């Protein structure tokens, strides 16, 4: 193909009824949204925005899309027996951790290209260096 259809998917309609546990809980969430759907989000928002999107190929597949360098970047997240990792050297246990971790470790370490780390989520960033340590957990 080597092409990219056009779309906006602009429509605010919440016809849900108290949805159970879901990525929503996190300040950042992204459904099956397509490329354009993510780009526009990190394109219109402030420089350094990010989010978590899932792939169609494998239900159990996530991706971190962040806007940087006048361009929207994306990363393919892996999943092993309920695990999460984007590199062979580094490996995490949960998606949340992988995210709350990058905020401290510049993606430049792994993705030399991206000389920046998660600055702001999809919904809203954090304040007062708020974080939740993992005591004997993980």
């Amino acid at each position: 193909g080597s092409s990219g259809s056009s779309g906006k998917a602009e429509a605010e309609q919440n016809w849900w009824e108290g949805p159970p546990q879901d990525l929503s809980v996190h300040l950042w969430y992204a459904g099956p949204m397509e490329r354009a759907g993510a780009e526009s989000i990190l394109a219109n928002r402030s420089d350094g925005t990010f989010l978590v999107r899932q792939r169609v190929k494998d239900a159990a597949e996530f991706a971190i899309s962040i806007k940087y360098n006048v361009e929207v970047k994306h990363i393919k997240i892996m999943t092993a027996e309920g695990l999460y990792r984007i590199t062979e050297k580094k490996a995490f246990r949960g998606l949340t951790e992988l995210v709350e971790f990058y905020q401290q470790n510049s993606l430049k370490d792994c993705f030399k290209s991206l000389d920046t780390t998660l600055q702001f989520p999809f919904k809203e960033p954090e304040k007062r260096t708020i974080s939740r340590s993992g005591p004997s957990s993980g």
Partner: peptide
């Protein structure tokens, strides 16, 4: 083929 780099690539230089 087998290889697939649709997304960003990790540190290449660093073997």
């Amino acid at each position: 083929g087998e290889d697939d780099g649709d997304y960003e690539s990790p540190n290449e230089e660093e073997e």
